[model samples]
Target: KVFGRCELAAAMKRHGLDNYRGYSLGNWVCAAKFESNFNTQATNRNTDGSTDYGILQINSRWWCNDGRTPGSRNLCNIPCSALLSSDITASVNCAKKIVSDGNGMNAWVAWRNRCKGTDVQAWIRGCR
Candidate 1:
């Protein structure tokens, strides 16, 4: 399957990531592979039976709603698929915006560090 390159790039740009080299796409892909096997449509349930959706496994119950439905084409609403579409750049960029306040991939780096036992600084370096 084609990864969401355009969406991911759009997300990166939204977060001020003009260049993708320093955004840690490798770590993100590794994490995705481990978490959901790189399946953008993957969904899981929490211990409390809450639902998580999409590549980053966003909590659907909290993030998904009438004004925030996926693929709604509304800026007010952030959709998971918008960040996981066939266009990787758009997907990644959208995901970056959703995670951080247009601050690039810092949040993603932090997440990968904490959750995947990765060295954040090293990952950042590799991105360069």
Candidate 2:
């Protein structure tokens, strides 16, 4: 369930990531690129007993409930497995919750390191 860059950019917009809480479409596109390279099945285990899952690489510590993390909040109230879907609706919805929960885009280190303060607009150019 991998996705092309522009294809994901377009689909992300349709699923409601576009301009969400002042985070631009390209910002999300860039984060997605670095986080999972558009792979829906992407998973990364952190050193802190938490795992990141899916395209956005949402973490299990505070977002998804994988039941393996030591102290999971499951703030998104979704199973971590759900984020692995190519559909991305649940992923996008959970991402929206992350943004609205006062964390904003800083929830992702990839976004801060790569997308933040950088010209990410190129990620979605010609994707209109």
Candidate 3:
């Protein structure tokens, strides 16, 4: 379910994701590049044995269900499998809900490590 960069950009824009919860489109796009390379099928195993899912790498700790993990917060109210679809409707909505749930991208390692305070123009260009 990985997409070309521009393809993903168009999808994000069409989904009304220009800047959800005060994070710029570039922040989300740049974070996606580092987190999952825009692969909707992407999943990462956390040190706690939980997992992250989808284009934004939403966490199983709160946003999704990995099935094996217990005591899920389920803030996004979505299955981990749902985030792995070619269609990103739920993924997009969940991402918005995520930032609104508590702190924003501060919880995301991708932002702390790369997308923050960097020149993200290349990741955001030509997506209007």
Candidate 4:
């Protein structure tokens, strides 16, 4: 699923995540940009022999499993493929589960390494 920036922002806002814990819209967009380019089907392999799935690039080792990998904690109890669908409800819920665990957006390498502490006006100027 492909989500436009503004559309994603609005959807996330509707889901109560317009920002950090529902407050940082800009950061949210920034992270999405660096992580998945807003494509829900996006995936990547990590050096730890795990995969990142969906627009949020959630870790297969930690959150959701692709049904092929074993021992995935499946912390959110949902399949990783569900996150690649147009209906992002599951993904958003999973993302919430991840962020609320206390690490906040710092859990995302893209967010922490590139988007953190940056001025992201371009990412969310009219996304509200």
Q: Which of the numbered candidates is closest to the native, going by highest TM-score?
A: 2
Superior candidate under TM-score, 2 versus 4: 2
lDDT of 1 at 74: 34
lDDT of 2 at 69: 99
Ranked by lDDT, the better of candidates 1 and 3 is: 3
TM-scores for all candidates? 0.47, 0.95, 0.91, 0.90
Model 2 residue runs over 4 Å out of place are none
Q: Compare the candidates by lDDT and give the number of the best one.
A: 2
> What's the TM for model 3?
0.91
lDDT of 3 by residue, 1-128 (tens): 88878788778878877777777777778877888888999988888778998888988888888787766888888889999999989888988887776778877788779988898657978765
**lDDT score, candidate 2:** 0.92
lDDT of 2 by residue, 35-126 (tens): 99989999999999999999999999999999999999999999999999979999999999988887689988999898899998989888
The whole-model lDDT of each prediction reads 0.47, 0.92, 0.83, 0.83
Give every collision pair in model 3.
Answer: none
- lDDT tens per residue, model 4, 1-128: 78899988888778777665754777777788889999989999878778898888999888997766656789999888898888778888998899998888889999999888889657877744
Q: For candidate 1, lDDT tens digit of each residue in 1-128?
A: 33343443334445554435444444555444544555666766566544555556554444443233333333325554554454444445445545555544443433555544564233233332
Q: Where's the lowest-lDDT run of ten residues in candidate 2?
A: 119-128
lDDT of 1: 0.47
The regions of model 4 sitting more than 4 angstroms off are none
The total number of steric clashes, by the backbone 3 Å criterion, in model 2 comes to 0
User: Per-residue error at 107 for model 2, in Å?
Assistant: 1.0
- Score residue 84 of candidate 4 by CA lDDT: 87
